[PDB]
């Protein structure tokens, strides 16, 4: 799968892409947890179990 | 106080009289308006103020929760 | 941080309160003494809003949906006294925090413009919006007689408050100060559109053309409507219209209830009962 893919860091600077991906992953994790907490089936706090 | 006349060495009297007159007039207007609002001290209603009595099961205001 | 031409302007002094105690910058912001006070007023207000959302109106209607979060004022039976925390005192504490934060913001602006050596038009203009808020939550409740006349703190609930207050007078369009304020708002929007359009048109001419001069700006509007107001006067007029709209809106809301308790159309009867007709 393209061994010379390491050249991609000569086009876009690593630092800004690292900042972007960290922010994006944090946002996605919070969103997925909130979506799960917003449903009757998967709400692990109000399920009553155990 | 003994030497209060020095207070006029720091504040200009010409502005002080204007400010004092304006403040006193504003205070008098505010106090008169406050009395006019109060239900006990309202001389505009007249010395012979006689509110309407309710003869039967009547109420001036509708009920509310 | 700093713009490439900003370091020449970061000088010491010009503070109102504090001196050298809080005279520093935090990132791009200047804080000062009023910066500290305003930031922490805002922080406590935000935290109390979040706690009020956590408690909810009940244990069943509590929700974290942002459109549905609402913190409500006390009942009209408490008068102007202090309500219990769960029954409407949180609203009063948050109102006090909001007033403190707004005043701190205005004073910090005064300090900044003292430092830069410029006029005081901006905090002066902000004071009008602050006064409109104060009429909404302080002057009208005191004149009416209870804190319950203030509006609730919520994104969608204060719209319900506006609607019900409007229909308490059966037709709110017939309020005259309301008409004046609306005329000012619409005129301000028109004037802003024209100012932006003209500046952009002069600065970005047709292709293969040079930047236009000051004579073109005046000629354009003299050839459209027969009069041109000028470069400084358009900013004068914009400020005047934007402040008159808010002043007349404050007048319109402070006379509804305290000074008029009937329908708004009926107010016009003085015109219809003249002996001329």
């Amino acid at each position: 799968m393209s061994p010379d893919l390491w050249k991609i860091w000569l086009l876009i600077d690593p630092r800004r892409v690292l900042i972007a991906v960290f922010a994006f992953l944090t946002i996605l994790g919070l969103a997925i947890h909130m979506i799960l907490l917003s449903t009757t089936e998967f709400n692990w706090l109000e399920d009553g179990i155990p | 106080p003994q030497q209060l006349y020095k207070i006029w060495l720091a504040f200009d009297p010409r502005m002080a009289l204007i400010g004092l007159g304006a403040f006193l007039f504003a205070l008098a207007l505010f106090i008169h308006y406050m009395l006019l609002s109060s239900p006990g001290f309202d001389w505009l209603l007249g010395p012979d103020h006689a509110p309407v009595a309710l003869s039967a099961g009547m109420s001036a205001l509708p009920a509310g929760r | 941080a700093m713009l490439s031409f900003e370091r020449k302007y970061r000088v010491r002094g010009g503070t109102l309160i504090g001196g050298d105690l809080f005279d520093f910058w935090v990132g791009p912001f200047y804080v000062g003494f009023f910066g500290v006070t305003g930031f922490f007023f805002a922080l406590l207000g935000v935290l109390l809003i979040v706690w009020g959302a956590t408690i909810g109106p009940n244990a069943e209607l509590q929700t974290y949906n942002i459109w549905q979060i609402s913190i409500a004022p006390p009942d009209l039976s408490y008068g102007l006294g202090m309500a219990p925390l769960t029954e409407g005192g949180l609203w009063q504490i948050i109102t006090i925090c909001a007033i403190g934060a707004f005043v701190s913001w205005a004073l910090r602006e005064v300090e900044i413009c003292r430092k830069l050596g410029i006029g005081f038009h901006i905090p002066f203009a902000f004071a009008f919006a602050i006064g409109a808020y104060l009429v909404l939550v302080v002057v009208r409740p005191i004149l009416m007689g209870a804190w319950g006349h203030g509006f609730p703190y919520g994104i969608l609930s204060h719209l319900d408050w506006v609607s019900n207050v409007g229909y308490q007078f059966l037709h709110f369009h017939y309020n005259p100060a309301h008409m004046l304020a609306i005329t000012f708002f619409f005129t301000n929007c028109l004037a802003l559109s024209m100012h932006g359009s003209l500046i952009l048109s002069v600065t970005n001419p047709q292709k293969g053309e040079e930047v236009k001069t000051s004579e073109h700006e005046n000629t354009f509007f003299r050839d459209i409507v027969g009069y041109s107001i000028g470069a400084l006067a358009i900013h004068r007029l914009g400020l005047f219209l934007a402040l008159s709209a808010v002043f007349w809106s404050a007048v319109c809301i402070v006379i509804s209830g305290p000074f008029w308790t009937r329908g708004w159309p009926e107010w016009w009867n003085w015109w219809l009962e003249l002996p001329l007709w």
Binding site: - | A10, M34, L35, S38, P39, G40, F41 | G79, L80, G81
Partner: protein, 43 residues
């Protein structure tokens, strides 16, 4: 202690203190008028 006026402007201190006292008195009267047990503007 009495040298406090060496580290404070006497005029500004008086000007600020008078406004502070006026506002405090106004607030206390407002609170007293809002309690039906201590409101004196009836009867």
């Amino acid at each position: 202690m009495h040298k406090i006026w060496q580290i404070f402007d006497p005029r500004r201190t008086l000007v600020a203190l008078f406004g502070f006292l006026f506002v405090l008195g106004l607030l206390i009267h407002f609170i007293l008028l809002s309690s039906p047990a201590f409101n004196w503007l009836s009867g």
